[model samples]
Structure formats: C-alpha cells, structure tokens
Target: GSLQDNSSYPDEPWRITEEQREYYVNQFRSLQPDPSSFISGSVAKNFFTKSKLSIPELSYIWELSDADCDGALTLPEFCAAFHLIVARKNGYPLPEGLPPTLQPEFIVTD
Candidate 1:
C-alpha cells in the first residue's frame, strides 16, 4: 500500500513556466496602449485591446482584480491578473458570466 493512493496530482503542474510568464509580460506590453493616448471612453477600449481581453472578459477580470472597480485596476489588479493566468493554465473552471469561448481555458497563456 503506497499511502492508499488517495491523493491526486494535477493533470499539469500549477507552476507558470518561464517562457509562459515571459510571453504574458510581452503580451501585456504589446496590448497596453499609451497612457497619454487615452481619452474619455478610451479607458475601457484601451483596457480591452491592450489586455487582449473582451468587454465581458475584462469585466470578469476587473471584478476579481479591482475589488473596488474604481474605473482602474491598481497593483492588486496586476496580482489578480497573474493569479487568473495561473488558474487558467491549471484548467480551473472560470465563472459562469464569461462567454463560453472566453472561459479560463481560452485565456491566453503564452
């Protein structure tokens, strides 16, 4: 008996590979619009394009990261983004409000 084999391991480790992390950082930079280029209503638009995230998807992320939803995602938001990325990579199910195609698995991991 090897510990009765009751424990289970994840299909894939929860670790974020170096390449994957680098890719996401690059994506963040590529999608991020010039802060100075933003105008009224552009905040939402920029957030979507720069983050490569759709409106509903952005909303879901924002809700989890924003915590206050003060029209901006702060440092905490960045941490939340990283967490979501890890969760998505590990195959965790996303919340129901997200579009079917925009589920956790659909979140770009690299």
Candidate 2:
C-alpha cells in the first residue's frame, strides 16, 4: 500500500495529528536519550561503551514500519512504532483499539 499521506496509512492514520506527533516525539526522545545521559547504569553504561544495540534497535523499529524494508520509513511507519509501543506497554494487542479478530497471545516477561 502506498503511504501518500497520514490518511492513507492503514497502520497509523493519525500521523498528521498534532497530539499524536507531540506524543510520539516525546516518547522517542525520552527512550533514546542524548549521549550525556549514558554515563551510568547497566544498560546506559553498556550502551555508551558498545553502541551495538542502539542502531539495531532503531533499525528494527524502522523495519517494523518500513513494511517493504526499503531502507526508509514513511510517516506511517514512524507513527506505527509509536502506537504499537504504547499499546504493548498498556497490555493492548497488535492493531490495537480494534475488536479482536483473533485470540490474543500471552507471554511472561521479567
């Protein structure tokens, strides 16, 4: 499917919304912090020293949005990541906020 604009993207039809953009940008910036904040802590310390998972994590996120894997994520792809992450954190299923068409899967995480 072609993502001509926010409306055309089935995964995320709200990228053009001011509220959505603000929410996603804030979330993204916070989760992936600036270099100065990565001096302490296990994950942060490992991240600054390694810088391995950082790019891959972002790339994996990009893969989720870039359905065709064209090396670039459209606005819809970016919005989808934001929506999916929030939904997952909130215990909502994929393609969330919609009626269930299939049984939900369960998993335990630490």
TM-score of each: 0.38, 0.36
Clashing pairs in 2: none
lDDT of 1 at 71: 54
Measured on C-alpha atoms, candidate 1 has an lDDT of: 0.47
- Per-residue lDDT tens digits for candidate 1, residues 1-110, read 45577777754343655656565444444544543221222343344433333344454544555444355553324533555645544567754534455435656756
Best-matching candidate per lDDT: 1
Best by TM-score: 1
Span of 10 residues, lowest total lDDT, candidate 2 = 35-44
Candidate 2, 1-110: lDDT as tens digits: 97566564344354365767776555434544542221122222222222232344333333344455354433334456555545534665444343454455644433
* C-alpha lDDT of residue 94 in model 1: 56
**Each prediction's whole-model lDDT (CA):** 0.47, 0.42
